[PDB]
Amino acid sequence: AHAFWSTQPVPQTEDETEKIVFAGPMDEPKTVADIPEEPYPIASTFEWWTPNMEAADDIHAIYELLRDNYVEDDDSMFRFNYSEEFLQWALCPPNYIPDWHVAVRRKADKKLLAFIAGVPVTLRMGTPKYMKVKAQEKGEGEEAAKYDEPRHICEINFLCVHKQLREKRLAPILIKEATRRVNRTNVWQAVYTAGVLLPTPYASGQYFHRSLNPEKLVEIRFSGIPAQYQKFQNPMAMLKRNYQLPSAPKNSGLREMKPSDVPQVRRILMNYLDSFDVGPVFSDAEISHYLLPRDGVVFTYVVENDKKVTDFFSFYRIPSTVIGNSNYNLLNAAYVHYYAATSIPLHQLILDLLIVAHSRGFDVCNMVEILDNRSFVEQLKFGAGDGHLRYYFYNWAYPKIKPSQVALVML
Numbered sequence: 001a002h003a004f005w006s007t008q009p010v011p012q013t014e015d016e017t018e019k020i021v022f023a024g025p026m027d028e029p030k031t032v033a034d035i036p037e038e039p040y041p042i043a044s045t046f047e048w049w050t051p052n053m054e055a056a057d058d059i060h061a062i063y064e065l066l067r068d069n070y071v072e073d074d075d076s077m078f079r080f081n082y083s084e085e086f087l088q089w090a091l092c093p094p095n096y097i098p099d100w101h102v103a104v105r106r107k108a109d110k111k112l113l114a115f116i117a118g119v120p121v122t123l124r125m126g127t128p129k130y131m132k133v134k135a136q137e138k139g140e141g142e143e144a145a146k147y148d149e150p151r152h153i154c155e156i157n158f159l160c161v162h163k164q165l166r167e168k169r170l171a172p173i174l175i176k177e178a179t180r181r182v183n184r185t186n187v188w189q190a191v192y193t194a195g196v197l198l199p200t201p202y203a204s205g206q207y208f209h210r211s212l213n214p215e216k217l218v219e220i221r222f223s224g225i226p227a228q229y230q231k232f233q234n235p236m237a238m239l240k241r242n243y244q245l246p247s248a249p250k251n252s253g254l255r256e257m258k259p260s261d262v263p264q265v266r267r268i269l270m271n272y273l274d275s276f277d278v279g280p281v282f283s284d285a286e287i288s289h290y291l292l293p294r295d296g297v298v299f300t301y302v303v304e305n306d307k308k309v310t311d312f313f314s315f316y317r318i319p320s321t322v323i324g325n326s327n328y329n330l331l332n333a334a335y336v337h338y339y340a341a342t343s344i345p346l347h348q349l350i351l352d353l354l355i356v357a358h359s360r361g362f363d364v365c366n367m368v369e370i371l372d373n374r375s376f377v378e379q380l381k382f383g384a385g386d387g388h389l390r391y392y393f394y395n396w397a398y399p400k401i402k403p404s405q406v407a408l409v410m411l
């Protein structure tokens, strides 16, 4: 059933994941010296290429591949259109390893045929709370705690094969080469997410959407008009009213994040994230990189009253190409990123996210039910979509956890 995934150090069935009680590696210990020094073999008509993610033109080439060939819905209505600026942000965080970004090109014209990207993340991925308790009850605390220390691992994203090369077993080759490059740097685990079900997620969450421009969302068939709106003389007018938001933020002291806020934002974020079983650890440089405002890419606001930062939220932009509509060709989506609330309820913090995103011309706000995202779904009028995000580890046995015990946002 899985000619590639059956050969890999991942849990092979749901049952297996159901049985795991302690975090830890799946494969035997290996050294960098054990890993092939030469690139994985590839057909003579292709070549491995390491793009330079800082160089505008190489980012452009990757941008074009993804624009035309990255994830689309099953009805081929929307395809992600991550921007060049977003891709430089996502793929070159502090201390990134250039060699972890892997492409295939056709040797003749050098047309870009495939890509996958790894970036460093420092992740807490030891045994979850519910399982450390079972371990205490059984006299097995030492085993349960062995891997408690945050680990420096690889986060994988942006796997893409050109549509003309689909179903040719190229993705397994790209994954093997990426694994080799990561292993040659003495890293042995990865974390990744996908919409599709593969062997085997340690957590799964539904996507939620909050309409900001319902007229446009209905026009492009992102949204339908719920049946009960047909009871109205003007179904669309009622839908627009339903989703109306204030034109200015409500929280006293909300303002954009600035560099001097990095230590305070790191503090309150780290205190909050600590409470979840799986979550990242960020340095000041990583807080700066992932949270300071960048035009068109990431938007971050703090609540400062009386000279202290007590709360913050962030969102990022991923537009999608709208493929077959007469009136629009772009969907402008805002995605809930990290946040932390200490002075106000989370719903009150995130309402100002929606207000700001709507003011800035976003059409929808998206999120997965990770973190405490479920705590403001109903009041703030999010609805569940039909999609899910599944969370996976490579070479890491991990108990099944609920998505509200995951604190890692994946771009």
Ligand SMILES: CCCCCCCCCCCCCC(=O)SCCNC(=O)CCNC(=O)[C@H](O)C(C)(C)COP(=O)(O)OP(=O)(O)OC[C@H]1O[C@@H](n2cnc3c(N)ncnc32)[C@H](O)[C@@H]1OP(=O)(O)O
Pocket (backbone or CB within 6 Å): 001, 002, 003, 004, 005, 006, 069, 070, 071, 072, 154, 156, 157, 158, 159, 160, 161, 162, 165, 166, 167, 168, 169, 170, 171, 172, 175, 178, 179, 182, 183, 187, 188, 189, 190, 192, 193, 194, 195, 196, 198, 394, 395
């Ligand atoms: C220690 C370091 C480790 C580093 C590596 C960690 C692992 C990272 C793993 C990657 C995490 C990526 C996270 C993201 O970016 S998820 C986003 C993935 N990208 C897209 O969906 C974009 C549009 N689609 C495509 O570009 C292609 O259809 C892709 C490239 C997805 C597959 O190309 P293609 O359609 O031409 O197929 P093939 O003949 O070459 O290969 C078929 C094999 O591929 C398995 N497959 C299909 N979809 C996925 C998928 N999303 N993750 C993992 N495996 C996938 C499939 O089950 C089959 O294996 P098996 O069922 O036969 O066994």
Ligand SMILES: CCN1CCC(N(C)c2nc(N(C)CCC#N)c3sccc3n2)CC1
Pocket (backbone or CB within 6 Å): 071, 072, 073, 074, 078, 079, 080, 195, 222, 223, 320, 331, 333, 364, 366, 385, 386, 387
């Ligand atoms: C069946 C009803 N649908 C189908 C479309 C669904 N949406 C918005 C959606 N939208 C997608 N894209 C690319 C736009 C995401 C946004 N915003 C993708 S990419 C893979 C699945 C998928 N699904 C949700 C509503």
Ligand SMILES: CCN1CCC(N(C)c2nc(N(C)CCC#N)c3sccc3n2)CC1
Pocket (backbone or CB within 6 Å): 071, 157, 158, 193, 194, 195, 196, 207, 318, 366, 385, 387, 388, 389, 410, 411
């Ligand atoms: C591989 C990592 N990511 C993480 C984010 C994924 N995104 C942005 C995403 N993915 C969606 N789905 C349904 C998962 C698609 C995939 N893979 C949806 S439905 C509405 C917005 C939306 N957005 C694209 C794939």
Ligand SMILES: [Mg+2]
Pocket (backbone or CB within 6 Å): 161, 165, 166, 167, 168, 169, 170, 171
């Ligand atoms: Mg292929």
